[PDB]
PDB file of C-alpha atoms and ligand atoms in Angstrom:
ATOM      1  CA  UNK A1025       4.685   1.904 -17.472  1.00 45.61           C
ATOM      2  CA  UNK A1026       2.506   0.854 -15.101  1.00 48.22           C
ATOM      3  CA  UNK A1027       2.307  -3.541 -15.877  1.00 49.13           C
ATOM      4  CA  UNK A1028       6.685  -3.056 -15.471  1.00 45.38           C
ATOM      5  CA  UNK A1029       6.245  -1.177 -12.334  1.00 42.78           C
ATOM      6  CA  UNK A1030       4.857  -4.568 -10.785  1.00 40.57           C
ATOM      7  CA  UNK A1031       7.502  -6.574 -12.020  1.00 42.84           C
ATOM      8  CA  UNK A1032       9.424  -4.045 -10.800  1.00 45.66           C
ATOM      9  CA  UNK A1033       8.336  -4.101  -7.775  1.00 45.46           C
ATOM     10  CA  UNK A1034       8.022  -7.227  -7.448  1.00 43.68           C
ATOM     11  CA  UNK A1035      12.004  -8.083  -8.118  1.00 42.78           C
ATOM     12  CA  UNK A1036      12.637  -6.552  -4.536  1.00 41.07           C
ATOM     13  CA  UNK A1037       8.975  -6.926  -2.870  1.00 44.03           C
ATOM     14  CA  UNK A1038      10.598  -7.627   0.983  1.00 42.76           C
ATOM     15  CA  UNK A1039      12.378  -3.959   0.329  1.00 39.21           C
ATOM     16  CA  UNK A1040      10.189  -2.073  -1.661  1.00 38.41           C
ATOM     17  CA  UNK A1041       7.233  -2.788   0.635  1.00 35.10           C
ATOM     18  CA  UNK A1042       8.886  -1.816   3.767  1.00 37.88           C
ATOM     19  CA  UNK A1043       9.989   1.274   2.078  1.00 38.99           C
ATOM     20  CA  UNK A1044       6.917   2.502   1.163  1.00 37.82           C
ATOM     21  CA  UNK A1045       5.277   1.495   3.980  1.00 36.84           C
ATOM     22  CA  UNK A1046       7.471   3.498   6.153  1.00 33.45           C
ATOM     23  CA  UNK A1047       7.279   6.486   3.929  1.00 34.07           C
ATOM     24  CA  UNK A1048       3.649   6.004   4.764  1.00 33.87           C
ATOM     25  CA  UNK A1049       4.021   5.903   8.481  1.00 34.74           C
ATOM     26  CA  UNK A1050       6.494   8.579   8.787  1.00 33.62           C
ATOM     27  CA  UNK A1051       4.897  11.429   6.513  1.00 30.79           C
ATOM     28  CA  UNK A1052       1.196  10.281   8.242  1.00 30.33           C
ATOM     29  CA  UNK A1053       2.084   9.806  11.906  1.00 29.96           C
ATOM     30  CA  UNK A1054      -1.150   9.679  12.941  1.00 31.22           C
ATOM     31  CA  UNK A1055      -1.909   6.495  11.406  1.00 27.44           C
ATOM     32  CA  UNK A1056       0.117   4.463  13.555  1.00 23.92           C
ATOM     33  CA  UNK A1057      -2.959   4.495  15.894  1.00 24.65           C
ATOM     34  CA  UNK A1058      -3.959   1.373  13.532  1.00 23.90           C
ATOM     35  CA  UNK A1059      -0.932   0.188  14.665  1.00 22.93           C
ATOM     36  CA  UNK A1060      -0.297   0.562  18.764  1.00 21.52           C
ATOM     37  CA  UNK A1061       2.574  -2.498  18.788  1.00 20.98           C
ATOM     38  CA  UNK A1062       4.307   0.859  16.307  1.00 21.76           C
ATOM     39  CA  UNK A1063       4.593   3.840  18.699  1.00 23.67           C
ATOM     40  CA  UNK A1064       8.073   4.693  19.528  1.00 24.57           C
ATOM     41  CA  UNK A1065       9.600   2.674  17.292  1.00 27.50           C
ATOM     42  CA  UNK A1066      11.974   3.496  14.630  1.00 25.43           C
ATOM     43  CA  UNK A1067      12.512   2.189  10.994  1.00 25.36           C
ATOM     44  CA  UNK A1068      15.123  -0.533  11.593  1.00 26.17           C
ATOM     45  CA  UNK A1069      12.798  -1.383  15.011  1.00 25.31           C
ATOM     46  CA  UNK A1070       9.992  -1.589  13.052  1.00 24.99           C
ATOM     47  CA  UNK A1071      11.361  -3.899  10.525  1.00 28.07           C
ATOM     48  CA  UNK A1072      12.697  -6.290  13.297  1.00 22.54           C
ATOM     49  CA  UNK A1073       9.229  -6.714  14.529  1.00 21.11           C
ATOM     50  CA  UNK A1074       7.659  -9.391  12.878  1.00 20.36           C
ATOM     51  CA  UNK A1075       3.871  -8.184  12.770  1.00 21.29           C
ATOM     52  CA  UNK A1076       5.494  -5.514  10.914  1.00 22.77           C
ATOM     53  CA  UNK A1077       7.094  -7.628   7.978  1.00 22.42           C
ATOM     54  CA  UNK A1078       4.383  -9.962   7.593  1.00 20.93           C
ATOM     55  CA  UNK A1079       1.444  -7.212   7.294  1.00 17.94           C
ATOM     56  CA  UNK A1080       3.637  -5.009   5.245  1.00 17.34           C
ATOM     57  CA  UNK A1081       4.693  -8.411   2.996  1.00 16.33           C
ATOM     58  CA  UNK A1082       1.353  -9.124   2.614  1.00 16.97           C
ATOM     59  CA  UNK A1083       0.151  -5.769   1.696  1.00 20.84           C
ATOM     60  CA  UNK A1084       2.256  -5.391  -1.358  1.00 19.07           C
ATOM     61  CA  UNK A1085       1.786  -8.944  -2.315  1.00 19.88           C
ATOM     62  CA  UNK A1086      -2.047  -8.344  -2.686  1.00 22.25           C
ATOM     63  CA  UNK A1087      -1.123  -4.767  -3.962  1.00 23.27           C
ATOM     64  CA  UNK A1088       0.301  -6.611  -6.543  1.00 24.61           C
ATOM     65  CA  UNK A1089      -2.143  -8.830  -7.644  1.00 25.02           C
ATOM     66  CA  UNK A1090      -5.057  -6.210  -7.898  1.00 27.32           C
ATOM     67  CA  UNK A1091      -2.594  -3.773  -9.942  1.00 24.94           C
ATOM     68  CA  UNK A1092      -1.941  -6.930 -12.336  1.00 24.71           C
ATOM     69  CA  UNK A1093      -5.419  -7.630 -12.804  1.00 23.12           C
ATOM     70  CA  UNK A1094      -6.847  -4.151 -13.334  1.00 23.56           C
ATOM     71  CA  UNK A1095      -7.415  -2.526 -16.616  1.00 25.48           C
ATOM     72  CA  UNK A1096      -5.770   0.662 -17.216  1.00 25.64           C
ATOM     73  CA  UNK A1097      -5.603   1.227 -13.619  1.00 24.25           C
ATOM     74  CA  UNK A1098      -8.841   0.311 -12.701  1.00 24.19           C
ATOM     75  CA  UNK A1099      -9.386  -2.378 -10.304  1.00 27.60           C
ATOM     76  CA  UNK A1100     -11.823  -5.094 -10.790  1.00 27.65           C
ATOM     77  CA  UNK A1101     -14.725  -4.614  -8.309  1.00 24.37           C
ATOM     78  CA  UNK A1102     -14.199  -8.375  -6.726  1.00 25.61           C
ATOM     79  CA  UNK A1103     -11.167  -7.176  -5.464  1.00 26.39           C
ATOM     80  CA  UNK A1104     -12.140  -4.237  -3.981  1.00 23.35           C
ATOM     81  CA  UNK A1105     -15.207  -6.358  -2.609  1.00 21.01           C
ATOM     82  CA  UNK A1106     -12.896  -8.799  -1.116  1.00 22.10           C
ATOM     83  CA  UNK A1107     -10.805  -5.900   0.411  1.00 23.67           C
ATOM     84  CA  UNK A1108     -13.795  -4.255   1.835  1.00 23.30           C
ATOM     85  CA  UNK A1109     -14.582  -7.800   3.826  1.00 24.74           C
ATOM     86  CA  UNK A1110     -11.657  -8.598   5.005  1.00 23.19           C
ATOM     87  CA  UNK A1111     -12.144  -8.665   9.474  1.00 23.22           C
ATOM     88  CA  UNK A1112      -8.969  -7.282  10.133  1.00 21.94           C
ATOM     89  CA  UNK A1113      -9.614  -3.824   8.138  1.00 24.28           C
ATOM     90  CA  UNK A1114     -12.805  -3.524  10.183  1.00 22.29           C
ATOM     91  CA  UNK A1115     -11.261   0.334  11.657  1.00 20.91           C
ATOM     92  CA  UNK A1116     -10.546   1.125   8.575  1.00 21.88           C
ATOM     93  CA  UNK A1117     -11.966   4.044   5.915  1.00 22.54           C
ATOM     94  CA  UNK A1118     -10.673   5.297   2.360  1.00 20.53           C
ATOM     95  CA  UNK A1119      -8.606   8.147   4.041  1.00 17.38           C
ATOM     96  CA  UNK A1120      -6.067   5.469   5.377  1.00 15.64           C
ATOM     97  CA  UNK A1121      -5.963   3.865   1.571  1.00 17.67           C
ATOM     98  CA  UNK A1122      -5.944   7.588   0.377  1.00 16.92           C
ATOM     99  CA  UNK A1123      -3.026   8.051   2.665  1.00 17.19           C
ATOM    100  CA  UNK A1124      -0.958   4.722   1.420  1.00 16.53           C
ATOM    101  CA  UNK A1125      -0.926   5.839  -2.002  1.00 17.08           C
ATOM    102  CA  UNK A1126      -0.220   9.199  -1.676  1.00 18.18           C
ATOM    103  CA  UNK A1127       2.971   7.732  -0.141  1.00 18.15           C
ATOM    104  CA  UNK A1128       3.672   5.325  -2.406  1.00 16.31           C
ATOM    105  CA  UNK A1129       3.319   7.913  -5.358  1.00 16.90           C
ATOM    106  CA  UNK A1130       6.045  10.283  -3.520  1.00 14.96           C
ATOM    107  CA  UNK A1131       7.919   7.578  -2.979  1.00 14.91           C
ATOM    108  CA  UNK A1132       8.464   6.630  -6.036  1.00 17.17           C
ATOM    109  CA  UNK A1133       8.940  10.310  -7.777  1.00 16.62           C
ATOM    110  CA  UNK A1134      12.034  10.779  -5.048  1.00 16.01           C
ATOM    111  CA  UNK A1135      13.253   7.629  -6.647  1.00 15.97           C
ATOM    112  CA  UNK A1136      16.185   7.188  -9.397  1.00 13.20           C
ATOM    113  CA  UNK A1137      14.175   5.097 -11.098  1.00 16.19           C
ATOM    114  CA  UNK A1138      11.453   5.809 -14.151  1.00 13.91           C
ATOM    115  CA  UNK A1139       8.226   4.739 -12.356  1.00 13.12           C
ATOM    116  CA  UNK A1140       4.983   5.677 -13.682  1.00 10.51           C
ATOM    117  CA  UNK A1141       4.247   7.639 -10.926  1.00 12.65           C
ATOM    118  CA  UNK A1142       0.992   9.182 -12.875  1.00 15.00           C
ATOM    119  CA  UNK A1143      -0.701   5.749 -12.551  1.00 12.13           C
ATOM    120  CA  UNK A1144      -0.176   4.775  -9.624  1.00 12.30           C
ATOM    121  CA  UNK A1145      -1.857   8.534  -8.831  1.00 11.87           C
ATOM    122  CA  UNK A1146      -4.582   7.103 -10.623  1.00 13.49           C
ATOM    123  CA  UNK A1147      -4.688   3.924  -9.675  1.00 12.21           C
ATOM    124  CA  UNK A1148      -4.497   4.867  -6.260  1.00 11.49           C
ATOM    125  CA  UNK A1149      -7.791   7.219  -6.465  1.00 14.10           C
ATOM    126  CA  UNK A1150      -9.451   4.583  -8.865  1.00 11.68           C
ATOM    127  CA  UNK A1151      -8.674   1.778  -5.814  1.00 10.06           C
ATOM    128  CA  UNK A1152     -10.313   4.526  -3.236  1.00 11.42           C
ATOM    129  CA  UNK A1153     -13.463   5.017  -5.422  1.00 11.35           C
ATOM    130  CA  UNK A1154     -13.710   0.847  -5.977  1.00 11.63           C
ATOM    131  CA  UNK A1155     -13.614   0.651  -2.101  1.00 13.74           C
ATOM    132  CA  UNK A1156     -16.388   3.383  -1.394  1.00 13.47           C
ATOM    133  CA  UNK A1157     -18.605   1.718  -4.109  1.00 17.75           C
ATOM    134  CA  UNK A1158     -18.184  -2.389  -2.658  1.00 17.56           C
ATOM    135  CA  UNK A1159     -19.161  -0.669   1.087  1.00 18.24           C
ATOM    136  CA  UNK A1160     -15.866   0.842   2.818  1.00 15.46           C
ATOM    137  CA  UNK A1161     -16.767   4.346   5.009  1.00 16.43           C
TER     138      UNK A1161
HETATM  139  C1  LIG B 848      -3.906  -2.645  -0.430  1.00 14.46           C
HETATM  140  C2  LIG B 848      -3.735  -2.363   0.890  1.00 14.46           C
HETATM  141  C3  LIG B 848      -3.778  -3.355   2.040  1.00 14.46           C
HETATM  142  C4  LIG B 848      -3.810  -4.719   2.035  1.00 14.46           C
HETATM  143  C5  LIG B 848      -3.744  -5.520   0.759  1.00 14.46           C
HETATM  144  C6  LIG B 848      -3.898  -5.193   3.388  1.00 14.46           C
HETATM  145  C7  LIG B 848      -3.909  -6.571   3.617  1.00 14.46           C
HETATM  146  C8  LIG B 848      -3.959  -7.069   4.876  1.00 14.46           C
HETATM  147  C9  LIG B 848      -4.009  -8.446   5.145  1.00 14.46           C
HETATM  148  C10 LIG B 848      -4.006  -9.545   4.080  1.00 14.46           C
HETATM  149  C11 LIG B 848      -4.093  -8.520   6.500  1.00 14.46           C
HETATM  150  C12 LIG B 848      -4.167  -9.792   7.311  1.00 14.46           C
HETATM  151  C13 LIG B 848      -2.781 -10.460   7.390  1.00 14.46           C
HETATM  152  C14 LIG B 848      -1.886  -9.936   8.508  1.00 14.46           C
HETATM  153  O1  LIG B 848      -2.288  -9.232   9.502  1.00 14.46           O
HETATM  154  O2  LIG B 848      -0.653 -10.236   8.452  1.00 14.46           O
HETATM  155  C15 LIG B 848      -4.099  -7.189   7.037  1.00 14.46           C
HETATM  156  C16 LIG B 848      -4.173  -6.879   8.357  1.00 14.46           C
HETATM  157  C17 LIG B 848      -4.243  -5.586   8.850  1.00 14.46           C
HETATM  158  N1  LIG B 848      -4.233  -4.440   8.192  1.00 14.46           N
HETATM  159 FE1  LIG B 848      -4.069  -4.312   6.330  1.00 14.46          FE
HETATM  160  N2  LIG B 848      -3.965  -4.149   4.240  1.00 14.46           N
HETATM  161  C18 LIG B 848      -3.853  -3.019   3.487  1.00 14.46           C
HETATM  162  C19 LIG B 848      -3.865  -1.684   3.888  1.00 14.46           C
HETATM  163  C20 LIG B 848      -3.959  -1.325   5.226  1.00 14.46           C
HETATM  164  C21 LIG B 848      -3.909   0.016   5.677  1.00 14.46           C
HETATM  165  C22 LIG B 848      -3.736   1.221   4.730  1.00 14.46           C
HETATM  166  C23 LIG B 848      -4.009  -0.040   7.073  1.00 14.46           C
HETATM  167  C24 LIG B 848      -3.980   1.090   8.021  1.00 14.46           C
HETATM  168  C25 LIG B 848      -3.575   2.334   7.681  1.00 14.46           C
HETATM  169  C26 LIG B 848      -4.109  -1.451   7.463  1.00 14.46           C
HETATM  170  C27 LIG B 848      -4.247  -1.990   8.746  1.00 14.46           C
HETATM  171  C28 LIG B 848      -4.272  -3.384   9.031  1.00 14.46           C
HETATM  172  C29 LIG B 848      -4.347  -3.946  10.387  1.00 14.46           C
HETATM  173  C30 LIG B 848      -4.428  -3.155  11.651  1.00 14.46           C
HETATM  174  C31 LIG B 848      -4.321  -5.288  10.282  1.00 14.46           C
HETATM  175  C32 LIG B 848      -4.371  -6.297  11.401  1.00 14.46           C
HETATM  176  C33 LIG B 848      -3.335  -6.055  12.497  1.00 14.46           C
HETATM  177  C34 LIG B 848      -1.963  -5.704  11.947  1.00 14.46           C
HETATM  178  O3  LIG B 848      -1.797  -4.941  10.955  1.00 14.46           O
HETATM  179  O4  LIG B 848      -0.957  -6.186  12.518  1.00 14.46           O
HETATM  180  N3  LIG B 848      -4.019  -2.191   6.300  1.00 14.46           N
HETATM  181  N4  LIG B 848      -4.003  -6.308   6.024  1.00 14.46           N
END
């Protein structure tokens, strides 16, 4: 279920995390726009580029930590509160979280492997509604 998905995930972060990142990317082009440094590139490019590895590592390693410290999917409101402040999401809104997830959950249905794709669904929507409640537009 859902707490083996994160060690899951967490055997293979580096890969798993560009993966669905660039699922992400590729089935929301328009996103990118967060990203300038991103246009034109491909996959491979964009894994070469090292802004690219580091946000995307960091990303799933915080992913991580608020999936392991929610409660049947539901994050604790500190760490949406803590998302919400960070400086460098200042463009940001729900939609692009929205957008992430619905990714990730994709991703992981198209994959060999028994993920519990229904919660991340859920805690992808629960994350969302955590966000909009600490202050994100
Ligand atoms: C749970 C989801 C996310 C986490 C935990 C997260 C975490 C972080 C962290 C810790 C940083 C600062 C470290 C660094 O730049 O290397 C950062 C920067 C940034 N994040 Fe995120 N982020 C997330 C989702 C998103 C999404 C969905 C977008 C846009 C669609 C986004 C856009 C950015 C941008 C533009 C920066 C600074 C410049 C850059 O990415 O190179 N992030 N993020």
């Amino acid at each position: 279920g859902f707490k083996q998905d994160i060690a899951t995930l967490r055997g293979d972060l580096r890969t798993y995390a560009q993966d669905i990142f660039l699922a992400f990317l590729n089935k929301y082009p328009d996103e990118k726009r967060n990203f300038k440094n991103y246009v034109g590139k491909s996959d491979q490019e964009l894994k070469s580029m090292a802004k690219f590895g580091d946000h995307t590592e960091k990303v799933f390693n915080l992913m991580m930590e608020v999936a392991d410290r929610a409660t049947d999917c539901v994050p604790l409101a500190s760490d949406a509160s803590t998302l919400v402040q960070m400086k460098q999401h200042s463009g940001l809104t729900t939609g692009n979280f929205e957008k992430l997830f619905v990714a990730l959950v994709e991703y992981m249905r198209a994959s060999g492997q028994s993920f519990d794709s229904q919660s991340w669904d859920r805690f992808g929507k629960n994350l969302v509604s955590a966000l909009s409640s600490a202050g994100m537009k």
